[PDB]
Amino acid sequence: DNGCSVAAESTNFTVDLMENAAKQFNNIGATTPVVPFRILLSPCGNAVSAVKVGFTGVADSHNANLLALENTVSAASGLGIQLLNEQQNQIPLNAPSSALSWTTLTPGKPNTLNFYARLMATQVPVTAGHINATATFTLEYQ
């Protein structure tokens, strides 16, 4: 059994990026403090060895590697959600399964995979408003 199961907690969860200073985005590429989030994979078998976690969704127009933000009347513009890994390395959005990075696991135990999320400015100055966004995470088992 090389396949794991996603728990009810990790089936659908919300990452709260809190309030961010519109002055923090001085230039294109300015980021924010990383906000950690975790995906609980349980139960798991005794044959699991590696999991590649990829993220899919609507990408930003200016930066193809940033998760886009819904365009409404009162939504921030010029930003994009950058999704990182455990070692704070960029995980591109809609990246091919070969471009991802394998993550080791422990067979027979509930394994928790830790990632980070932050905001990266694509335009200057960054407008104010709210940040609502949805992504779908996929798993490649090994």
Partner: protein, 156 residues
């Protein structure tokens, strides 16, 4: 291959008066090295090491005062102001925790909502001073004493 699940993201970009300096957003405070003879009993504290959070592009027409609230893992119940140490492979110090003080010399409550003393702001660059000590919850044990705490700035 597996569809997995959906992760939602919520937040807000507000018009904050200032912006945390790129040095201050992630800083390492080298407390140094302490002796178990100094940390020998409950309530025994070591000497303090000072660190600063620097704000930039402050505007006094938006907000004239600022405060910082720290969030961390408490070492024990009843010691909410003492931050728990991280674990090391060789070993970590027991009965010791990092304690963050204020600009008034009072240790802050590491709950994420007990803000510190409000400092008035001037247009430009501002600096918020803080200090860090080692608070003993008992007879200390040798080991690496590393910790980590996050913070949020309230402009009022």
């Amino acid at each position: 291959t597996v569809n997995g699940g959906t992760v939602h993201f919520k937040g807000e970009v507000v018009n904050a008066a200032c912006a945390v300096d790129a040095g201050s957003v992630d800083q390492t405070v080298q407390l140094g090295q302490v002796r178990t003879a100094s940390l020998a009993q409950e309530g025994a504290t070591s000497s303090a090491v000072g660190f600063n959070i620097q704000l930039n592009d402050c505007d006094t027409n938006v907000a004239s005062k600022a405060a910082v609230a720290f969030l961390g893992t408490a070492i024990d119940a009843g010691h909410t102001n003492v931050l728990a140490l991280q674990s090391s492979a060789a070993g970590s110090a027991t009965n010791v925790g990092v304690q963050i003080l204020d600009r008034t010399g009072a240790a802050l409550t590491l709950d994420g909502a007990t803000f510190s003393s409000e400092t008035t702001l001037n247009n430009g660059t501002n600096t918020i001073p803080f200090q860090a000590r080692y608070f003993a919850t008992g007879a200390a044990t040798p080991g690496a004493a590393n910790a980590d705490a996050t913070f949020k700035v309230q402009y009022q």
